[PDB]
Amino acid sequence: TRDANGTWEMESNENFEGWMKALDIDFALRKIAVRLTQTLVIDQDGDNFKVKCTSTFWNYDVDFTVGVEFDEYTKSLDNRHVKALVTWEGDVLVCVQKGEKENRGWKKWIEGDKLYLELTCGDQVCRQVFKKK
Numbered sequence: 001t002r003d004a005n006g007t008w009e010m011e012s013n014e015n016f017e018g019w020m021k022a023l024d025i026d027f028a029l030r031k032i033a034v035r036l037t038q039t040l041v042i043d044q045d046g047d048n049f050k051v052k053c054t055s056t057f058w059n060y061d062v063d064f065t066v067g068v069e070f071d072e073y074t075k076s077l078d079n080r081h082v083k084a085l086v087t088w089e090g091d092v093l094v095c096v097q098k099g100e101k102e103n104r105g106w107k108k109w110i111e112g113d114k115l116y117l118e119l120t121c122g123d124q125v126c127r128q129v130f131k132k133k
């Protein structure tokens with residue numbers, strides 16, 4: 001339940017546009033992002049994670065150590081500085097990103113070869129489901 005290693009292919013993505021709009025992503029870009037197939041690759045070594053979410057010309061990468069606050073600059077997204085922190089709440093991997101936006105972060109629930117990812121910003125939640133390839 002705590003092993004997120006692998007290559008994960010998207011099965012579903014709900015409220016992606018509402019969450020992107022809460023982050024202030026350009027409206028024109030949102031209409032492109034909605035079309036792009038996403039692949040999520042996670043390398044997890046103890047507390048050390050490398051997360052890479054990739055598409056045709058738009059990627060999001062983040063590396064972190066569980067329990068260690070880090071400065072995150074969302075250079076490929078909304079271009080903001082947040083103080084990010086990833087922790088385990090039971091078997092849920094929880095990220096809080098402290099900064100301008102309220103309720104900003106993400107959570108992963110790993111259920112075998114399924115990964116549920118919820119991205120939050122403001123009053124918006126984006127719900128994604130991936131299957132391990």
Ligand SMILES: *C/C=C(C)/C=C/C=C(C)/C=C/C1=C(C)CCCC1(C)C
Pocket residue numbers: 020033036038040051053054055058059060077106108117
């Ligand atoms: C644990 C997994 C996480 C935190 C994955 C996060 C992925 C993203 C924030 C992806 C964002 C993207 C866009 C908003 C537009 C299109 C390109 C993406 C998929 C990289």
